Amino acid sequence: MVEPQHNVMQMGGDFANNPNAQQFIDKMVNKHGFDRQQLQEILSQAKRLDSVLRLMDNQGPNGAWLRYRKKFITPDNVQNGVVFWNQYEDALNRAWQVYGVPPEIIVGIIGVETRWGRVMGKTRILDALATLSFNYPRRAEYFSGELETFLLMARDEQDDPLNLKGSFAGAMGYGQFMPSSYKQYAVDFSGDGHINLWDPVDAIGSVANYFKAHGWVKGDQVAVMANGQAPGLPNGFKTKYSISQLAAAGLTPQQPLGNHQQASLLRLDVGTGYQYWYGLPNFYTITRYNHSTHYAMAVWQLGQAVALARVQ
Numbered sequence: 001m002v003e004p005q006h007n008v009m010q011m012g013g014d015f016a017n018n019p020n021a022q023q024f025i026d027k028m029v030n031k032h033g034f035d036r037q038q039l040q041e042i043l044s045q046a047k048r049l050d051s052v053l054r055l056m057d058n059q060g061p062n063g064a065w066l067r068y069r070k071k072f073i074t075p076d077n078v079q080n081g082v083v084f085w086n087q088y089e090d091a092l093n094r095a096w097q098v099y100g101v102p103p104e105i106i107v108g109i110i111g112v113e114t115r116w117g118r119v120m121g122k123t124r125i126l127d128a129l130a131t132l133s134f135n136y137p138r139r140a141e142y143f144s145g146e147l148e149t150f151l152l153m154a155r156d157e158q159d160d161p162l163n164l165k166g167s168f169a170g171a172m173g174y175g176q177f178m179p180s181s182y183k184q185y186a187v188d189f190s191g192d193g194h195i196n197l198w199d200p201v202d203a204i205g206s207v208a209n210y211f212k213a214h215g216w217v218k219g220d221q222v223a224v225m226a227n228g229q230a231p232g233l234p235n236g237f238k239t240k241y242s243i244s245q246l247a248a249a250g251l252t253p254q255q256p257l258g259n260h261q262q263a264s265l266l267r268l269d270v271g272t273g274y275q276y277w278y279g280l281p282n283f284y285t286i287t288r289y290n291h292s293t294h295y296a297m298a299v300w301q302l303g304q305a306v307a308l309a310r311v312q
């Protein structure tokens, strides 16, 4: 009837003689009450993907921004964004009221991440996370905690750990949430009692709660383009200068900056020249989702493009 299989201490597969996997299995049993044998049967099925290890290692004015921008802001993309927006308008409006996060931001995020559920990932999450946990010393501790949370997530949502697919880093669903983002930020916005990252309505609320959690200020400006040039000052979303300093570099806000006394100096390579922007706090909040100036500007502008295509 019952098969304890205590004597089956050594598993097969790609992580068969892996010290890191054996340590992991011990932590899950001890700390979470997992059954060693059941876990071994799972991890023995996990694959060591060289592509995942190669991709994590892989990570003027020549028109940099334009090449990045046109990867997302195209007629076909803006049109699908309109459809997704109108289809999930109730969830989008409800998220605005509860979280203060606007529709165009959530639409832009889901748009750039998975093109609205069209490109969600083809790699099994266990393979990716197990590969980066047991064969990648550089980020092994970070990905171990992600595999840990993933296993617990698959247990809490009654998911079979092997049926779930996503990115090469183990990101999941419409919003490409990492296992730790699911734990800390995902919410049951659809109200069915479950938190599905692959459910459009849950994805919307979770992306909204993520933003609020990271300080998104309702109605506050995201960024404001500047008149003038400032080649002497360093730039990017991590920079920090006062409005007085920026003004001294020869800049001025194309729109009133409110009460803001500081901003980051963003610079977009528009081919013919450089375009400077006053990066406000809401812009930074976007980068907390994906640490990149280009990402954040692409998310915002994509949402803006879709906002206009609905107006018409």
Ligand SMILES: CC(=O)N[C@@H]1[C@@H](O)[C@H](O)[C@@H](CO)O[C@H]1O
Binding pocket: 171, 175, 176, 177, 178, 181, 288, 289, 290
């Ligand atoms: C939306 C989401 O899950 N974003 C995560 C973010 O929390 C984390 O700070 C970063 C680590 O580099 O990786 C992103 O994938």
Ligand code: NA
Binding pocket: 187, 188, 189, 190, 191, 192, 193, 194, 195, 196, 199, 202
């Ligand atoms: Na739900």
